[PDB]
């Protein structure tokens, strides 16, 4: 009986069963109207729910919350609830049958190039993809990898960006071009941050005493896990 609306950019689009909520998206579940399409009697507690996917960004969230406000505006007896992926109330979970799937419709906001300049941590793998050609400098790729001792591999170089502290970890079996590219990446991050960071190049097995404790805290504390 309930009407379920999917935020798509600045649009609300109605969807039908089966409901597969994308975890990067926002749905508005309208439980405010009686079978025929008329507003429900305030005695029957009309409700509107805003379901927030765990990966949904501010535009999808704001479009969905404003859409619920607009339903409340036309019928003030409506009660609005926000539900969060994986912690939905027993009541919401009673009125819609749904599953949650991995997926993300991009929001409508246009991307502008501004650095928020807030503490963020990342680990990068620095590797040449073809050593058969006799150079370790011509096919360098930089991939983000999870912040963890588990991502460290002897064969490559890793840049551990702890914002103000930057470590270049040299695998004992890594190549010269990966060391050069690793150090150049650390230098670029240091330069972007007006040179305030401390930059260290460390070798595998010869890590300073603080090193692996520092890697654990970065993984726990990383304010933007992505």
């Amino acid at each position: 009986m309930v009407k379920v609306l999917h935020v798509q950019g600045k649009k609300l689009k109605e969807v039908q069963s089966p409901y597969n909520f994308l975890n990067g998206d926002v749905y508005v579940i309208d439980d405010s109207k009686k079978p025929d399409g008329s507003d429900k009697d305030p005695v029957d507690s009309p409700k509107v729910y805003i379901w927030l996917g765990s990966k949904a960004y501010a535009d999808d969230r704001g479009v969905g919350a404003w859409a619920a406000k607009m339903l409340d505006k036309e019928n003030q007896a409506i009660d609005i609830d926000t539900e969060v992926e994986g912690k939905e109330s027993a009541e919401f979970k009673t009125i819609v049958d749904f599953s949650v799937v991995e997926g993300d419709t991009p929001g409508f906001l246009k991307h502008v190039e501004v650095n928020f300049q807030d503490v963020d941590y990342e680990m990068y793998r620095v590797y040449d993809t073809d050593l058969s050609d006799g150079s370790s400098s011509d096919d360098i790729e930089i991939d983000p990898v999870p912040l963890s001792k588990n991502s460290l591999k002897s064969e490559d170089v890793f840049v551990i960006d702890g914002w103000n502290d930057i470590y270049v970890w040299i695998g004992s079996k890594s190549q010269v071009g990966e060391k050069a590219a690793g150090n150049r990446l650390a230098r670029k991050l240091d330069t972007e941050r007006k040179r305030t960071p401390m930059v260290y190049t460390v070798n595998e097995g010869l890590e300073p005493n603080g090193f692996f404790e520092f890697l654990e805290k970065l993984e726990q504390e990383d304010p933007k896990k992505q």
Binding site: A56, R61, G62, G64, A65, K69, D72, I80, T82
Partner: peptide, 27 residues
């Protein structure tokens, strides 16, 4: 609060000059 996907909630807003607690009910 709207940017967080809510119409009810209490915002802690702390900038350069002032900090506020602002409770909000349905917008």
């Amino acid at each position: 609060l709207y940017a967080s996907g809510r119409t009810t909630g209490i915002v802690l807003d702390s900038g350069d000059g002032v900090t506020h607690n602002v409770p909000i009910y349905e917008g």
